[PDB]
Design a protein around this ligand. Structure first.
Ligand SMILES: [Ca+2]
Length: 42
């Protein structure tokens, strides 16, 4: 399963799929944090 839906994100803790537009916002749509535990800035 090399993806979910359009450029969406998959979390290796659990397996869920999240709307990847929300990988750099500071709150966490995945079952952990991996949205943005790697999307720093300034
Ligand atoms: Ca998020």
């Amino acid at each position: 399963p090399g993806g979910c839906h359009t450029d969406e994100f998959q979390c290796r803790l659990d397996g869920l799929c999240i709307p990847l537009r929300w990988r750099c916002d500071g709150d966490t749509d995945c079952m952990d944090s991996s949205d943005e535990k790697s999307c720093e800035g300034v």
